[PDB]
Write a protein that binds this ligand. Sequence first.
Ligand code: GSH
Ligand code: GSH
Lengths: 206, 205
Amino acid sequence: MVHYKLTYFAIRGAGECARQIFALADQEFEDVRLDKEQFAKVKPDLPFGQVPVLEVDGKQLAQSLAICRYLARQFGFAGKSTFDEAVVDSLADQYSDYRVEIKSFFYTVIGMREGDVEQLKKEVLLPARDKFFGFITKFLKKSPSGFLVGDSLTWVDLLVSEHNATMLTFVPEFLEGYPEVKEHMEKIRAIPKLKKWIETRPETLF
Amino acid sequence: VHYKLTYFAIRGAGECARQIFALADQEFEDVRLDKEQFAKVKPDLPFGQVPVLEVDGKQLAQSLAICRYLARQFGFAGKSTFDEAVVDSLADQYSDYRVEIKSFFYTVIGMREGDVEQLKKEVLLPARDKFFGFITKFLKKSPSGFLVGDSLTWVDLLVSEHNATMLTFVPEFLEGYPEVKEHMEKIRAIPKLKKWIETRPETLF
Ligand SMILES: N[C@@H](CCC(=O)N[C@@H](CS)C(=O)NCC(=O)O)C(=O)O
Ligand SMILES: N[C@@H](CCC(=O)N[C@@H](CS)C(=O)NCC(=O)O)C(=O)O
């Protein structure tokens, strides 16, 4: 078969989306989780000095979005047409811009930077969430299938669903008045093969 | 197929797509808005921002998604799915790089308060050194001269245009990277692209 090796830290973060893709494609792969010191040794042989890095039959591929998209195309979770795929691509990119806005809150609460959690929540996180959910909700209200794009699962369903499940861990109010976003999160994570992975994967915060 | 690129009267995020149409000899509507006309159309855009591309009325936002979509249509995305992915990662790396230098970039075009010189010497140049380190590595291991595979792909157009733009503000930008200089020249010498470079509206970025 094609052999796959996901290399990333001992956390979900940027590597998780790809791990969910393999779970849903029932695709077996090597799932390498590194500590700081192990990373420091392999780092210079990585295409951009960072992780996640995927290997397909030895050949290296960096950047989480590129990884997830590549794997989604192989297994049928990218979109059922080239334009639909592009629409999925834009949701993924929007989500990434959203991650930049909340970077300050997100790295404070995992505790790898110091700051005031509470005003970062109120002033940074929640306004960025309101804007972003405003867009997500619009795609959901105009999708009667229940997925963000088209009539089936695509990998942005997995990004947006996992992020929201993760954030409820730190901010229980997070999906406070957005029932359609709540619905989506539940719908996707109820897919038995995904739920299985959720139950069996190593438990990490974020 | 009718195409409509909507963006501001600048190159910035919209230019990559404009270069794709130039190279595909694809005619399209090229809509450049001022602040006040944007403010009026903004709420009907998918994420409230530009660039937005329309294919036969169907709206598509996010510059990377636009460029990749158009590249696939016209044959500039990569000649396999993995090669396309490798092109995707270069594009994404470049975008991370844009985040690092955001503070310098908006100060020097003068649409932001700033401390030019330490931003240049402490922010811009170290981010460039790291980024060019990667770009150079792809170039040294590419016998064709393009960042990926043996032909033009849309990241060639992003990286080439950004470097030409930055030389405008920082003339020492490419100095200790002749291979990056080469790449910039190689791509922008492609006649169809050079013709667009000579005929497009001149803007200060
Ligand atoms: N755009 C990159 C960002 C990922 C990233 O920054 N990962 C960090 C871990 S938090 C890394 O690999 N190294 C951190 C470092 O050494 O700077 C991606 O999606 O892979
Ligand atoms: N992250 C988006 C860029 C979206 C964006 O910030 N667009 C700018 C122009 S370069 C804009 O429209 N700014 C004004 C606004 O959001 O109202 C992309 O990757 O295309």
